[PDB]
Amino acid sequence: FPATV
């Protein structure tokens, strides 16, 4: 999965 904040 891609990075989110």
Place this chain on the structure above:
Amino acid sequence: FPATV
């Protein structure tokens, strides 16, 4: 802490 199972 010591090991328990």
Place this chain on the structure above:
Amino acid sequence: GAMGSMERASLIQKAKLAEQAERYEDMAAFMKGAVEKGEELSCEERNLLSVAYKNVVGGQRAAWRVLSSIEQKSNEEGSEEKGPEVREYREKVETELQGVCDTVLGLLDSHLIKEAGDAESRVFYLKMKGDYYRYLAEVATGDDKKRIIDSARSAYQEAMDISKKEMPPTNPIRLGLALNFSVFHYEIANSPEEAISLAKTTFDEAMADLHTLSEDSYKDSTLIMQLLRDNLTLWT
């Protein structure tokens, strides 16, 4: 609400304790209580709120993906029929996730967003609104799926418009918003070119503004810039 009798300051204190103890469900319940006092949140308080619900929903999403994967396998040709249990339990976790999302969206709508006048607060809340519609979209399969996706898009877009007008390109909230909207494009909206373009432009514009910053601001901004780079590396 069960937090109605507890002091606002006590709820914030306990949210911090819950964070130290990795008790994110408690942290979230304390922050909900704090928001429901009706006063605006400070910078630190907004962060506490977002941390709590990110950890809770993050766990739910991870579990939902495990269960959805098992469920998909069960519907492959040659798979033995095992009954309704996998669907039921995926549904259970899904319903709990949706409930958390609706709770957060509830707090934002009643009345965090409408009272948020400064860019840092308004952009942060609108980002969260985008994020929690995005989580609803990840599990949506019905009549309202398109409207859920558009609700995410609309909130992110409003946040974007404000952030570009009111914040420098290195602002961590602006960076974080862009990171997540870029992910929205890639994973939800079927727009990988838009995702890549956004991540690249955001990265490059931030790079060009790092010279204006202190060492500590530099560390904060570059950390999020690396996440933009990580995603770009994943996608290209």
Place this chain on the structure above:
Amino acid sequence: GAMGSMERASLIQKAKLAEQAERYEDMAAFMKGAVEKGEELSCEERNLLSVAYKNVVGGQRAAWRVLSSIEQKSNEEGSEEKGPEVREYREKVETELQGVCDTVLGLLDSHLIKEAGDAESRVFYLKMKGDYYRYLAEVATGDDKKRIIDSARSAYQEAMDISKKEMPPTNPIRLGLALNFSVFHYEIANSPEEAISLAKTTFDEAMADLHTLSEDSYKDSTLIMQLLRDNLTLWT
């Protein structure tokens, strides 16, 4: 009970799904439902039960230790008075932990232990009874603290007596019981010499019996033997 309407086999199926998804609270609720059907548990089912509640209470214990440490620091000379919040929240977590322990002890008393005739089942349940009284003891400070400690000791001792008569020294349940009773001696009963003696004797007697085992049984037994060695290394 909310699991009263669900099939026993469906509860076991969902407990396994919950385990895969790391949803230990759910796993525990499903296994409680399964036990409450009133049939005896198989080997696999007993393991599911113990895994679920070990993970749940393990998290509670970890959090309790974080909070108790902060609380201790607050009562050091020179520490600013911050109000009742740390005590309140430690108490909240403590009460939840005690509730889980009472739930497990409830299942064992109604009626898992009384129906358990074979050594493997009876020793396993009596070990769990010792374990959950040990967790109650870790947080006990009142009139009943000694009686809670003795309840743990008594259950472990009964388990020990059966295990020595009915199981080979390499049996993983016998090994695991000894590991945990040894920890009981060290951490709860203020008997570090008894803890060390037990861990050593158990290790050595198992070593001497490994020659009788298959490769797979050897792997199972040696794994627990290493935990005995790890504790001995910690304590000497």
